[PDB]
């Protein structure tokens, strides 16, 4: 059950995908406050 | 820059009142700063100012005075 089959290598892509999701959800949080009739305008 | 462009605007339409339009607009935002601390959403704050404005414009038209007044003009001299 252990020690057999295969072992995962180069686990950085697992962290790269996490860094891409966290950075994308951070952008979606600022625009989330503008959703619906109760949303607010964003001055840039 | 909004009140800067608002003071420059007031000259275009009416030509007078650049002093009163800035003080009123600054006070509407000043008292609304405590209204958002109540958690009241701006749409409720904006609607409260607009519904009160619709009744305010109608009230001004009810309290206006005609230019007739007395026999002589006695208006344009006092207007200036
Ligand atoms: Mg004046």
Fraction of residues in helix of chain B = over 70%
Ions, cofactors and other ligands present here are: magnesium ion
N→C terminal distance of chain B: 31 Å
Count the DSSP helices of chain B.
Answer: 4
Structural class by SSE content of chain B: mainly alpha
- Helix share, percent of chain A: 40-55%
**Span between N and C termini of chain A?**
56 Å
Measured by DSSP, the beta-strand proportion of chain B falls in under 5%
Helix and strand run of chain B: HHHH
Query: Whole-number radius of gyration of chain B?
Result: 18 Å
Biggest sheet descriptor of chain A: none
- Structural shape of chain A: rod-shaped
**Gross geometry of chain B:** flat
Radius of gyration of chain A using CA atoms only: 19 Å
Number of strands of chain B: 0
Organism (chain A): Saccharomyces cerevisiae (strain ATCC 204508 / S288c)
Subcellular location (chain A): Cytoplasm
Subunit structure (chain A): Heterooligomeric complex of about 850 to 900 kDa that forms two stacked rings, 12 to 16 nm in diameter.
Family (chain A): Belongs to the TCP-1 chaperonin family.
